[model samples]
Target: MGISWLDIYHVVSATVPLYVSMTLGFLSARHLKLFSPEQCAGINKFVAKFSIPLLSFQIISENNPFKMSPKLILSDILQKFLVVVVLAMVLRFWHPTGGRGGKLGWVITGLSISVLPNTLILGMPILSAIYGDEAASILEQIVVLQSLIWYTILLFLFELNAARAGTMKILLKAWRKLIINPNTYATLIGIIWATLHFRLGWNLPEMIDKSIHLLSDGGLGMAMFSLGLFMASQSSIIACGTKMAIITMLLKFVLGPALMIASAYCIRLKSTLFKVAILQAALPQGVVPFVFAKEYNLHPEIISTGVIFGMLIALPTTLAYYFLLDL
Candidate 1:
């Protein structure tokens, strides 16, 4: 059977709302004389400090604990890490991208993020409406398993690559800036509390949970929105911004998933595994790494632009995947 082509449209659908809002902002800045709006940033900080952390806390605490396969998890991690490393190396072959923001930006950009949306917040509701909770839950769990393994390994390999290229001294310096790492700390704490059984103290009852859920939901959209806003701020320099967008799309659509597909032959996972991995890779730029980059003052611009571009592309890509995969 031929490809549906509709999936492509769906992916593009997700990308437009993001692109329009951001582009408008970017254009408005020309006359308004604003580099970046404070309100846009406020959106991000609220999402990070309040919404995302709460979601993580509840996702870890409320869920039933399950034992996982060590081998499977390790293999998944390696697949993600290697793909990210390979892509980062690919992205770095640019016109001398080093120094303060440049180094951090390139390093962060090349990290090759794998984004899996939360089934609880975005996934369960949407997919469940269409496919039923049973199907949605199962599909989402696979997404979760793959995303977790991929994201952490990508992060670790980013650190590893930066250290190897810049020297261990640089890595140690990154450590000194620990509190600034939003996702790293959130993921770390979630794991510790989830696996080790430490309670965060049920202080606010359900109020925190509801508020957090709302924010986590908004964070996904806000992330795309923020990217749009950032891009609008730099409208005068679209040519420069274009390169980063190109690099991001190439890594996301080409290098990252291509590596995973090539490696799947060795792992011999079910035939659908590669497809799932590729679809996950096709998702809009994840909010976590951007969040981390912002915390540590990296190339937030590149990451932000990636998110905006990805969102512009996501709707059509996602829809395309939805239909094409059925084929």
Candidate 2:
């Protein structure tokens, strides 16, 4: 199938709503002066602590883990594994400059910028439009891994960096904090619920499911909204400056899809699955990671810049991939 106006409309339909929500937040905070800095921070806290975790729970619980494609899963895992390995080598040999956690901080941010994609939000509409339901199903598997595995790993890294000291006691302290994180609980519990639902044929009560739906539905929208608030609080839209934002774009769009290409080839992932993996890699920098970055007081500026610029360019970039791969 060739790219068409309809496909463009589908992608725009999926993405425009996110920008609208984010714009509302930006206008409210920056232009309208509706929310103070303190309120914006509090709203971010609510997103990080409550809505996102519930979103994770709802997503993970809804997926059929038993039906996961092993090769696809392996490809994704390998891609992330390669990223961690490369970042570790950088940490070992080179000293990258940044604030707070020194080289380690930039490395962590680099890891996130390079790997995480806005798989659920943008991936669904874009890939479904281009490759149909099969691609959508493949993306669902990737999303499951993103929430269940990669996000948890990102949190652990953040906590470890925050702990700073290499002492075993400090490391354990970091682990404890990760253990208590709401995201952690959400993933664990969601997996348990999914297992029961699939294996033992269980279902959530109507009231309980509805409660989760109410919050989980708002997870990504609020994330974009919080991002807007963050943008308003910053000095400019490109919070990390032009050069760094360009670098973030390269990492998100170029480095990420390159790694996926390697991983897909290595796993012999052919046809639609292979294409989906690469395109999903190139979607955009995930919003939740930005939320986590802000929460942990890491390089939130860099991430925010990535999210903004990445989303801005994602449509054309992704469509380019679709055209090239289809040919």
User: Against the true structure, what is each candidate's TM-score?
Assistant: 0.64, 0.94
Give the CA lDDT, 0 to 100, for residue 42 in model 1.
69
Q: How many residue pairs clash in each candidate?
A: 21, 0
For this target, which candidate reaches the highest TM-score against the unseen true structure?
2
Q: Can you write out model 2's per-residue Cα lDDT over 1-327, one digit (the tens) per residue?
A: 556898888788888898898899999999999999999999999999999899889889989889989998899989988877876776667554442236667777987888888878788878787778888888998899888998998999899988883489887988998999999999999999999999999988999988888877888789899999998999998878777787778878888888888999899998887888898888778789999998988889999888877776778888888777866
Q: How close is candidate 2 to the true structure, as a TM-score?
A: 0.94
- In candidate 2, where is summed lDDT lowest over 10 consecutive residues? 94-103
User: How does model 1 score by TM-score?
Assistant: 0.64
Kindly list the per-residue Cα lDDT of model 1 for residues 1-327, writing each as its tens digit. Answer: 232355344434544554555565555544565544676566556665665555555554443235443333444556566765664565456433432224444544565344332233333333333343443434444444533444454455455444444466776755544335454566566556555553444344477557656656655555544554555555433323565557666666556545545555456655444444444445556666665555344556666656545555544554465576576
Q: List the pairs of residues colliding in candidate 2.
A: none
Candidate 1 residue spans exceeding 4 A from truth? 1-43, 59-72, 88-104, 112-173, 179-185, 192-208, 211-217, 236-244, 294-297, 315-327
